[PDB]
């Protein structure tokens, strides 16, 4: 629901 859209959102965090 909001775990597959958050996982791809947090992936941007890595980006220094």
UniProtKB/Swiss-Prot annotation:
Compartment annotation: Nucleus
Protein family (similarity comment): Belongs to the Antp homeobox family.
Function text: Sequence-specific transcription factor which is part of a developmental regulatory system that regulates segmental identity in the mesothorax. Provides cells with specific positional identities on the anterior-posterior axis.
Additional record remark: Loss of Antp results in altered development of the embryonic thoracic segments. Overexpression can cause antennae to be transformed into legs.
Protein name: Homeotic protein antennapedia
The encoding gene: Antp
């Amino acid at each position: 629901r909001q775990i597959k859209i958050w996982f791809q959102n947090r992936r941007m965090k890595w980006k220094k």
